[PDB]
Ligand code: HEC
Ligand code: HEC
Ligand code: HEC
């Protein structure tokens with residue numbers, strides 16, 4: 072298992088880059104995000120070739136946008152899906168964690 076990044080890392084889309092901080096996610100199993108692929112574990116970039124490499128489409132399993140923003144019902148938890156659950160318990164974090172603008176992801 073490679074070391075978890077100790078500084079925010081870039082999550083590049085086609086037009087915007089969002090910084091991802093691992094620290095606040097220390098109590099989330101690595102596997103929740105870096106899910107198994109072909110039964111084997113992987114820590115490759117979500118947008119890697121052969122993964123979620125469609126950086127422009129809004130929907131589809133190949134879309135990086137969808138796996139990040141789908142508000143739920145997927146095979147794995149998206150950023151927005153989990154954030155909505157967190158925000159339900161800690162409402163003061165609504166804009167910070169789910170906002171489309173002026174949020175922690177999109178300042
Ligand atoms: C409100 C629900 C939001 C809207 C609408 C958008 N976001 Fe995001 N977002 C996040 C990441 C990690 C990325 C990069 C990976 C990717 O999606 O490709 C993005 C990117 C965008 C983009 C640009 C897509 C592109 O450049 O190809 C748009 C137009 C966009 N987002 C709309 C992360 C998050 C996040 C963190 C948990 C939140 C709260 C939001 N995004 C919220 C919205
Ligand atoms: C979801 C909330 C995550 C948890 C929990 C962990 N990581 Fe992560 N990691 C995540 C993202 C969105 C990214 C960037 C992906 C991209 O497309 O850029 C990362 C990045 C890494 C990397 C480096 C390579 C990279 O993609 O930039 C490593 C080595 C990594 N993550 C390791 C790691 C470990 C070991 C975790 C558990 C202790 C772990 N991550 C949890 C999302 C999430
Ligand atoms: C390529 C080797 C991949 C990497 C690295 C990551 N994902 Fe992935 N993801 C991949 C496949 C082939 C599949 C479908 C089969 C499965 O294991 O579920 C997925 C699926 C997801 C989903 C669900 C999408 C759906 O259509 O329901 C999510 C939410 C997801 N993947 C997220 C994700 C993130 C955020 C990653 C980086 C940290 C990541 N995946 C890496 C293949 C690959």
Ligand code: HEC
Nearest residue numbers: 091092095096099103104148149150153154157161175176
């Ligand atoms: C739940 C299983 C999570 C997943 C998947 C993702 N995030 Fe998250 N995020 C989660 C928690 C528990 C928290 C902490 C909230 C708190 O109580 O303080 C967060 C925090 C962040 C932050 C805010 C960090 C800060 O400014 O201090 C960001 C920017 C963030 N999360 C981004 C993010 C992205 C891009 C994700 C998808 C790859 C993602 N989170 C998934 C829980 C969970």
